[PDB]
Amino acid sequence: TQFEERHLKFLQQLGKGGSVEMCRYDPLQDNTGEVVAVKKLQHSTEEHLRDFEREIEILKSLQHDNIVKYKGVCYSRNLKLIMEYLPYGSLRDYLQKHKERIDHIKLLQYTSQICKGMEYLGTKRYIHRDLATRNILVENENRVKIGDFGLTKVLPQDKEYYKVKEPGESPIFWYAPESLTESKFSVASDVWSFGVVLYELFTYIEKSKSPPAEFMRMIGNDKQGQMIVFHLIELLKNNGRLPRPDGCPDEIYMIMTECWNNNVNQRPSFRDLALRVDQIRDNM
Numbered sequence: 001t002q003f004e005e006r007h008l009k010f011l012q013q014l015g016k017g018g019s020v021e022m023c024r025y026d027p028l029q030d031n032t033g034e035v036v037a038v039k040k041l042q043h044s045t046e047e048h049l050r051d052f053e054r055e056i057e058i059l060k061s062l063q064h065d066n067i068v069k070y071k072g073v074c075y076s077r078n079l080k081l082i083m084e085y086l087p088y089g090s091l092r093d094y095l096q097k098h099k100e101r102i103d104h105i106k107l108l109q110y111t112s113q114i115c116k117g118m119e120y121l122g123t124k125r126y127i128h129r130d131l132a133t134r135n136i137l138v139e140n141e142n143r144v145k146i147g148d149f150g151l152t153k154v155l156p157q158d159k160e161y162y163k164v165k166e167p168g169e170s171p172i173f174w175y176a177p178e179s180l181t182e183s184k185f186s187v188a189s190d191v192w193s194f195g196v197v198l199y200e201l202f203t204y205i206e207k208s209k210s211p212p213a214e215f216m217r218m219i220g221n222d223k224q225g226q227m228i229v230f231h232l233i234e235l236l237k238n239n240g241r242l243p244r245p246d247g248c249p250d251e252i253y254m255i256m257t258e259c260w261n262n263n264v265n266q267r268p269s270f271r272d273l274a275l276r277v278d279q280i281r282d283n284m
């Protein structure tokens, strides 16, 4: 069933980078309609349209408790992607506001759910590419979901990585070394980014400890532009890593270091991450 553009009412702009708005779908014109999240393109080049339609088919083929829900598309191309609205916003903002009132056991609940959504995504041969707490959404106290599939690629049939020929804006401080050097993305590079997510969680989003702040201090704050990427590559090749966060249990920190292995084949799988984190949880 269809969404008519005429009945989509604007409420609030939520974020940009396309843009995401809060709308009410109100066919009845008496404001009783469902509140939804709407993504639309702000600069609608032919390349971007075709990227956006691929994003739409990716989100639509996904159905999992820990993946943001597709609801439909509104036509008039200038497509709008209609999705569920998650009112607690991104995990990053949520953790920031509610800091250490979220205990380690709760952090591990979210980490488990992140690994399950990621493992399900991999069974369809999708590489998220932008796994980070700002792209995880909170449905309620007991559930998060993976969002913004903006950067997601499908693996070729005959290959286990996808090579991005002309990169756009890239979250380098979450990127595996092979992604930095050769622009190669794989299930294993998602696992590397997951390690950085787990770091984010255990720092409680303290600004002076964010991945960009720490890596910049390690390479020196005088590095600029593409010299940053050059020094970050050398640093990672020589075992420079993010530190253990204040108060982080030793075993969760081991998992982070394991995901940050230079050797792609030695990084753990999301299936084994979810098993291990559920084991830590039960122990606690």
Ligand SMILES: O=C1Nc2ccccc2-c2ccnc3[nH]cc(c23)[C@@H]1c1ccc(O)cc1
Binding pocket: 014, 015, 016, 020, 037, 039, 055, 059, 068, 083, 084, 085, 086, 087, 089, 135, 137, 146, 147, 148, 149, 150
């Ligand atoms: O994950 C999203 N994050 C953002 C980013 C910026 C502004 C708002 C949101 C957001 C906020 C609240 N509910 C949402 N549902 C889906 C999205 C979203 C979002 C969304 C966008 C594209 C997509 O493929 C899947 C989800």
Ligand code: NA
Binding pocket: 008, 009, 010, 023
């Ligand atoms: Na609109």
